[PDB]
Design a protein around this ligand. Structure first.
Ligand code: HEM
Ligand SMILES: O=C(O)c1ccc(C(=O)c2ccccc2)cc1
Ligand SMILES: [Cl-]
Ligand SMILES: [Mg+2]
Ligand SMILES: [Mg+2]
Length: 393
């Protein structure tokens, strides 16, 4: 009843151009079986959304990578938020919600916006730049480590650590094995910075530790919650901002609409998250036998959710393969959905909005003018290099 497919959604050929295979995954049925990895796959919008909103059956506490924590040892201690189900999830989630709250955004917005404006002006003085190294990476590196309260020493480990984290949710392919092997120096740096003495008062990390006084988290939970922000809060934004710039470079008509109304910046960023889906996939594990789209899945099975596919499903989206900065984006699953929906979404949107606002006000054209290179990761979609010429407004 369930179709069996040989598509490897973690192969380099798939990463290089996933769209035909994602349509094959959607059109084969609401649920497929991926023989390459012995997992179920769910690629249409409706079923992806339903699974994400059914946490008592499609759980996170057995891991959201391929590995099942009831069968294998996790490569690092489990995340107290990502890899937990309610009720254990709830209080750690509340702490990160408050640390990354609407009220907190007020305290960082001026500096985040000023840094974005300055970066765009700096890049305009160069003209021809690499929108990854010089923009998508440089901007978050200039604001997020400081907002976390990290010391200066060791920050070179942050992007390597995040790449490792995101590769490690994948299957045990070469990308994963290479990432985990000799990763101890990156782990040691991150784990050290999670300790309270290393985090500047007033930053996100110190604020997490301050919540240990309230009874929401114990002192020994705080370092792992700092670890969550250092795992999930940098490389995601690099790929989100890179996605938005790549969209504006390829759709000049949409750049022109953004220039004419810079208040579209926030939705232009949200649409880039839908369109590229910088976080492509994650897993759940069934806690019981369950029917999904007519297919019966046994207990203890891994289920792979294709967020990028759901975000392009023609059953749900008109003109899904068009980047449209005025699209009604609500309901896209690029930040997930339900109880685990990205707790950092306000930080992500703040960074994306202020960068696109700076581009909207300062740049007249974005032209690809060198070889584009894709970056491969088991979970993240994005570019390694994006040479562009920026023309000033
Ligand atoms: C464009 C940028 C981002 C994207 C696309 C993104 C995507 C996601 C997705 C899809 C999830 C859900 C995972 C699941 O359901 O298993 C998630 C969760 C999470 N994200 Fe983000 N994220 C982004 C930025 C950030 C930032 C900036 C932070 C922190 C500063 C952050 C921290 C987290 C955390 C801690 C979780 C776990 C939440 C929970 O399990 O309750 N993310 N993110
Ligand atoms: O708590 C953490 O360490 C953590 C939290 C969230 C993420 C994340 O966005 C993500 C994880 C797995 C798959 C797709 C996205 C990764 C790590
Ligand atoms: Cl670690
Ligand atoms: Mg260890
Ligand atoms: Mg010291």
């Amino acid at each position: 009843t369930i179709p069996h497919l040989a598509i490897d959604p973690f192969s380099l050929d798939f990463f290089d151009d996933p769209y035909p295979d994602q349509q094959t995954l959607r059109d084969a049925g609401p649920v497929v079986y991926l023989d390459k990895w012995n997992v179920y796959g769910v690629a249409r919008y409706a079923e992806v959304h339903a699974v994400l909103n059914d946490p008592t059956t499609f759980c996170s506490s057995r891991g959201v990578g391929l590995s099942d924590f009831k069968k294998e040892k996790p490569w690092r201690p489990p995340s107290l938020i990502l890899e937990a189900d309610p009720p254990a999830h709830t209080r750690p989630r509340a702490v990160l919600s408050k640390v990354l709250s609407p009220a907190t955004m007020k305290t960082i917005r001026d500096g985040f916006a000023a840094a974005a404006d300055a970066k765009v002006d700096e890049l305009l003085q160069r003209g021809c730049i690499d929108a990854i190294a010089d923009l998508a990476e440089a901007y978050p590196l200039s604001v997020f480590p400081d907002a976390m309260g990290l010391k200066q020493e060791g920050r070179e480990h942050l992007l390597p650590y995040a790449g490792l984290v995101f590769n490690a949710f994948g299957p045990p392919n070469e990308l994963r094995q290479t990432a985990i092997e000799r990763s101890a120096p990156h782990q040691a740096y991150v784990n050290e910075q999670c300790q309270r003495p290393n985090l500047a008062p007033g930053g996100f990390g110190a604020c997490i530790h301050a919540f240990t006084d309230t009874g929401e988290i114990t002192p020994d939970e705080a370092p792992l919650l700092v670890r969550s922000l250092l795992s999930a809060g940098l490389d995601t934004t690099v790929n989100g901002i890179g996605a938005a710039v790549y969209c504006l470079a390829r759709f000049p008509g949409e750049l022109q609409r953004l220039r004419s109304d810079p208040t579209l910046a926030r939705n232009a960023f949200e649409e880039a998250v839908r369109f590229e889906s910088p976080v492509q996939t994650f897993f759940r594990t069934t806690t019981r036998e369950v029917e999904l789209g007519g297919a019966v899945i046994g207990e203890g099975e891994k289920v792979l959710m294709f967020l990028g596919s759901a975000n392009r499903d023609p059953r749900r989206w008109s003109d899904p393969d068009l980047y449209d900065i005025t699209r009604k984006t609500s309901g896209h699953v690029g930040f997930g959905s339900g109880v685990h929906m990205c707790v950092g979404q306000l930080v992500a949107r703040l960074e994306g909005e202020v960068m696109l606002s700076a581009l909207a006000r300062k740049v007249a054209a974005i032209d690809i003018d060198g070889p584009v290179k894709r970056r491969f990761n088991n979970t993240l979609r994005g570019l390694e290099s994006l040479p562009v010429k920026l023309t000033p407004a």
